Tab-separated table of C-alpha atoms in Angstrom:
chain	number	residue	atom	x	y	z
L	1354	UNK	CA	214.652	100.868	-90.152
L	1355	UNK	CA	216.034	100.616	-86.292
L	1356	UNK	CA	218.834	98.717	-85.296
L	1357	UNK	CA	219.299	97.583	-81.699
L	1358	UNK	CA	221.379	101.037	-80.738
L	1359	UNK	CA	221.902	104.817	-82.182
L	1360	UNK	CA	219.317	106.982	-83.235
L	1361	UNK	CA	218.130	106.054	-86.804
L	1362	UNK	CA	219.028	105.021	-90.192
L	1363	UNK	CA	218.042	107.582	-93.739
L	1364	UNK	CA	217.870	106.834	-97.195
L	1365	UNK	CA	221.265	109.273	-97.769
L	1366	UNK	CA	222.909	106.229	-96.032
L	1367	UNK	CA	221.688	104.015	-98.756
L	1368	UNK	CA	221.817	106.108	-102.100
L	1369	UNK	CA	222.616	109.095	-103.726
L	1370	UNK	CA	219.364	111.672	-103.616
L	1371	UNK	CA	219.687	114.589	-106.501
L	1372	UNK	CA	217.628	115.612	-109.789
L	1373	UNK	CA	218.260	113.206	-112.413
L	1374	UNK	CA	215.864	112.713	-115.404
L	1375	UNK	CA	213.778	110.057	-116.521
L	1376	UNK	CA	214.984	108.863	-119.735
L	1377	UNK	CA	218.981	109.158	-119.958
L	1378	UNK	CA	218.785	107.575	-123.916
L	1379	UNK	CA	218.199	110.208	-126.117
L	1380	UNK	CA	220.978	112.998	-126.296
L	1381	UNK	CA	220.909	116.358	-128.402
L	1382	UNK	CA	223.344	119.313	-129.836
L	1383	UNK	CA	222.712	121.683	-131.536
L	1384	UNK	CA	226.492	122.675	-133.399
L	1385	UNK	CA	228.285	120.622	-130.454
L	1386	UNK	CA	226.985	122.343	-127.793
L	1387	UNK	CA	224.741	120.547	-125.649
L	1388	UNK	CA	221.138	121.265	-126.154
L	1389	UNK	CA	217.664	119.949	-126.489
L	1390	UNK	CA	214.722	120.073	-128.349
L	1391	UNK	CA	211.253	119.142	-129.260
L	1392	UNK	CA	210.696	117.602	-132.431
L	1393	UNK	CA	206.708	118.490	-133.551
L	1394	UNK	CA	204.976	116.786	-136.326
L	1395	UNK	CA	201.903	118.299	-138.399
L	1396	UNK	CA	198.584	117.465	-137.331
L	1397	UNK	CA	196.357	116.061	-139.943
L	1398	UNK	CA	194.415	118.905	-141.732
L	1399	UNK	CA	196.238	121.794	-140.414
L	1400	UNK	CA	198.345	124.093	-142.346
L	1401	UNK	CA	202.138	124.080	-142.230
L	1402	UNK	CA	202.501	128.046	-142.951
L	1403	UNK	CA	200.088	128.807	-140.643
Q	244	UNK	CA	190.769	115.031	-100.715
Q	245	UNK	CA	191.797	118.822	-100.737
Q	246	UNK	CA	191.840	121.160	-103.708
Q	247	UNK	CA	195.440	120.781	-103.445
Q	248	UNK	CA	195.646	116.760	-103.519
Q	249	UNK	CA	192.907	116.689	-106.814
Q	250	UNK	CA	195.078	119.348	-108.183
Q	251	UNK	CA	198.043	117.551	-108.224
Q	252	UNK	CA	197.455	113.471	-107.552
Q	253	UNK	CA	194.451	113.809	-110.543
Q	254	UNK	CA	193.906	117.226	-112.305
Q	255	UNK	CA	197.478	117.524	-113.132
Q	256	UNK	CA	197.919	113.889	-114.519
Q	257	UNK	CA	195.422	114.227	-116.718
Q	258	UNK	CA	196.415	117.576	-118.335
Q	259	UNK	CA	199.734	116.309	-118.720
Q	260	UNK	CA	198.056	113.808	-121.644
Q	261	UNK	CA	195.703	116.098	-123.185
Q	262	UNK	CA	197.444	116.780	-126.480
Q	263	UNK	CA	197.559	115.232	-129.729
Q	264	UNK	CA	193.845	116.028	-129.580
Q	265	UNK	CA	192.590	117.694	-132.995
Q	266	UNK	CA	191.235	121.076	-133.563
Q	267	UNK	CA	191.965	121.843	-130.051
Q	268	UNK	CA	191.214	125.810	-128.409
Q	269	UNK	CA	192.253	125.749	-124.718
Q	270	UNK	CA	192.105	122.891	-121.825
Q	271	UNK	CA	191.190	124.574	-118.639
Q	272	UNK	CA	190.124	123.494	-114.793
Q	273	UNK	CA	189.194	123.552	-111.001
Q	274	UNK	CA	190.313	121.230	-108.019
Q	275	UNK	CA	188.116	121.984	-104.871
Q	276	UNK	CA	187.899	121.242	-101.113
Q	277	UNK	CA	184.584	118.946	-101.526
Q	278	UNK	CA	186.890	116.601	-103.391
Q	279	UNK	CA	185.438	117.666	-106.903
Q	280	UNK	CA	187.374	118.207	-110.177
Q	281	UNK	CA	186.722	119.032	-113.618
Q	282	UNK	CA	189.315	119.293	-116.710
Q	283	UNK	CA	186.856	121.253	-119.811
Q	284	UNK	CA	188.956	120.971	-123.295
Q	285	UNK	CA	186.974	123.268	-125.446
Q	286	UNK	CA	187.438	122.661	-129.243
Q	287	UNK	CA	187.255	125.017	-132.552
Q	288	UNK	CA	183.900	125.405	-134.034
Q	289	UNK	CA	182.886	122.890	-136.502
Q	290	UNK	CA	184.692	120.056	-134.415
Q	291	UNK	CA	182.567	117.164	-134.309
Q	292	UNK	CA	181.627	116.153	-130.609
Q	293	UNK	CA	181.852	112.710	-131.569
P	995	UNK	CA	198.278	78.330	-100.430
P	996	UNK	CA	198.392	77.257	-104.372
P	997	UNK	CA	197.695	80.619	-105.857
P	998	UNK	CA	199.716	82.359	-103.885
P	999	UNK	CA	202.485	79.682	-105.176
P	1000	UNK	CA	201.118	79.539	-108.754
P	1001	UNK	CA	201.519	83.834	-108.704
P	1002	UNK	CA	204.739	83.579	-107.099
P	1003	UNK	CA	206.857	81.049	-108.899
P	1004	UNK	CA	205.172	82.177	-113.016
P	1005	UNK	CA	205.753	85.447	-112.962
P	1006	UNK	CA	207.916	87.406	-115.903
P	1007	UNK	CA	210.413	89.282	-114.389
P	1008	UNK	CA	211.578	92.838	-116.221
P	1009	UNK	CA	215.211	92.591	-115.540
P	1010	UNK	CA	216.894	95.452	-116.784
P	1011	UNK	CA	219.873	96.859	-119.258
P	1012	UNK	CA	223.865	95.680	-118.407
P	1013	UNK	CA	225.234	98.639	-119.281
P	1014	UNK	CA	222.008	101.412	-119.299
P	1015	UNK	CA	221.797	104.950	-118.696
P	1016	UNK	CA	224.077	106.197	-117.246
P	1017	UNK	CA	227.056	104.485	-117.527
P	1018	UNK	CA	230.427	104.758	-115.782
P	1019	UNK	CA	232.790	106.328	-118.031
P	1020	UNK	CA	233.833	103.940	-121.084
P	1021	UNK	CA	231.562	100.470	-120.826
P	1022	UNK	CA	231.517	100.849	-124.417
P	1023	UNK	CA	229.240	97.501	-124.091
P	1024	UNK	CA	225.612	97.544	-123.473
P	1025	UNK	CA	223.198	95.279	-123.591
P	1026	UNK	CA	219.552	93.774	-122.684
P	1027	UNK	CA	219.383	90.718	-120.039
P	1028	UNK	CA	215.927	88.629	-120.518
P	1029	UNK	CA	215.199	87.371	-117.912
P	1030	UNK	CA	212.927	83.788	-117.430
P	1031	UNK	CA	209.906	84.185	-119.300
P	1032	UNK	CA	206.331	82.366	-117.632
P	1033	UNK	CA	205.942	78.676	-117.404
P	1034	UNK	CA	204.853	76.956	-120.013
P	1035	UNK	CA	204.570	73.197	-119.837
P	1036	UNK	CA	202.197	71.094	-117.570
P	1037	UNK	CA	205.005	69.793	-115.965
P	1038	UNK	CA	206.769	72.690	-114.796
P	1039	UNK	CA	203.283	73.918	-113.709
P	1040	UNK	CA	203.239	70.013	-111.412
P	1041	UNK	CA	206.016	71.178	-110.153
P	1042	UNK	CA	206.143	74.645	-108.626
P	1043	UNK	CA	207.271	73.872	-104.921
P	1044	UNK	CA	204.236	74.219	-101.753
């Protein structure tokens, strides 16, 4: 918005603006250090090996 | 709507959902300046259309 | 005048986690805050304010 005086007011004056992520629940590591992964299951039919 | 808004307000949305879909080959598509979009997920032979 | 009412005063409201992610170092206590659920009773329905 405007107030009565100054030039204007931002949203940095309001909140903090970086890259976060979406979910913050899950958490992975992979021997301690920090990590992720994906977790795939087998689709019906379809051959493990291959 | 430009190629560039279908791409990425409805092309991209989409695509980002197409998985967990059986017997799957490739997912491909076009966004274009008359507003049109298509998303074609071509299957494996012998996949039932159904 | 009444709908507008009716929406406005029998409406679940999310309200979120007391303690959700993230967290300020330590917490060490999380947990979920319902809310008021819709109404239920005629009454309360007779009742929501004009």
């Amino acid at each position: 918005k405007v107030n009565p005086d100054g030039s204007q007011v931002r949203l940095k004056d309001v909140a903090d603006v970086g890259l976060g992520g979406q979910d913050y629940s899950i958490n992975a590591q992979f021997n301690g250090s920090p990590a992720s992964g994906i977790a795939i299951k087998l689709a019906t039919g379809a051959n493990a090996l291959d | 709507a430009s190629a560039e808004t279908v791409q990425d307000t409805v092309v991209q949305v989409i695509e980002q959902q197409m998985n967990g879909i059986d017997n799957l080959r490739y997912i491909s598509s076009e966004s274009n300046s008359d507003g049109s979009m298509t998303i074609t997920v071509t299957f494996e032979q012998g996949t039932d259309p159904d | 005048d009444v709908s507008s009412a009716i929406q406005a005063q029998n409406v679940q409201i999310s309200s979120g986690q007391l303690g959700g992610l993230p967290a300020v170092k330590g917490q060490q206590l999380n947990a979920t805050i319902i809310g008021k659920t819709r109404l239920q009773t005629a009454e309360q329905f007779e009742n929501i304010l004009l």
